[PDB]
Amino acid sequence: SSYGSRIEREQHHLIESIEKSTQYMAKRRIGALISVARDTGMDDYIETGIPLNAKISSQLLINIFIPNTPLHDGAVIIKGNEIASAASYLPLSDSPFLSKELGTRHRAALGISEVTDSITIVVSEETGGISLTKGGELFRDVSEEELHKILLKELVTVT
Ligand SMILES: Nc1ncnc2c1ncn2[C@@H]1O[C@H](COP(=O)(O)OP(=O)(O)OP(=O)(O)O)[C@@H](O)[C@H]1O
Numbered sequence: 001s002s003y004g005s006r007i008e009r010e011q012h013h014l015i016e017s018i019e020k021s022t023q024y025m026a027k028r029r030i031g032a033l034i035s036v037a038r039d040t041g042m043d044d045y046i047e048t049g050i051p052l053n054a055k056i057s058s059q060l061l062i063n064i065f066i067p068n069t070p071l072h073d074g075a076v077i078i079k080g081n082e083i084a085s086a087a088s089y090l091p092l093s094d095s096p097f098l099s100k101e102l103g104t105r106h107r108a109a110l111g112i113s114e115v116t117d118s119i120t121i122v123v124s125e126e127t128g129g130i131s132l133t134k135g136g137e138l139f140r141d142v143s144e145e146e147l148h149k150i151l152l153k154e155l156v157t158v159t
């Protein structure tokens with residue numbers, strides 16, 4: 001409908017914001033952890049975070065992860081067309097198959113990918129590498145094209 005196109009516009013704006021914010025943060029080596037809900041699992045984890053219920057924008061994400069406010073200390077949960085919360089808890093994965101150069105950010109992303117079907121994006125504070133988790137799998141140091149391809153497939157309803 002005009003509902004469908006509208007949702008499609010919102011979803012592309014979402015993808016765009018994540019990509020741009022993560023690109024900027026990758027350059028500046030700003031650690032980031034952004035989980036995008038695709039079900040009703042993230043509800044418990046949203047409540048552990050600081051409530052924002054704000055509109056999705058690249059500037060907001062980037063500012064969230066600046067290491068000088070309590071907002072950076074955790075994950076950003078995106079739900080519907082909103083940044084539901086910042087500084088949320090994500091469960092660490094107990095996988096020994098995870099690389100050892102990777103730390104608690106990636107491990108948190110992995111865990112949430114294991115117990116939900118949400119897409120999670122990580123920006124390494126150390127390497128500036130961008131990674132992604134879904135279904136208990138981690139795609140490491142993904143390229144912009146690769147990132148865009150996945151986000152498009154997983155977060156934009158084709159219709
Ligand atoms: N369970 C968790 N839930 C949410 N955020 C977490 C969790 N564990 C760690 N973090 C975030 O990760 C940050 C430090 O990450 P750490 O260096 O331990 O892992 P890392 O993968 O090496 O991160 P980076 O690759 O960006 O250096 C902390 O400031 C914290 O905000």
Ligand SMILES: [Mg+2]
Pocket residue numbers: 103104
């Ligand atoms: Mg570390």
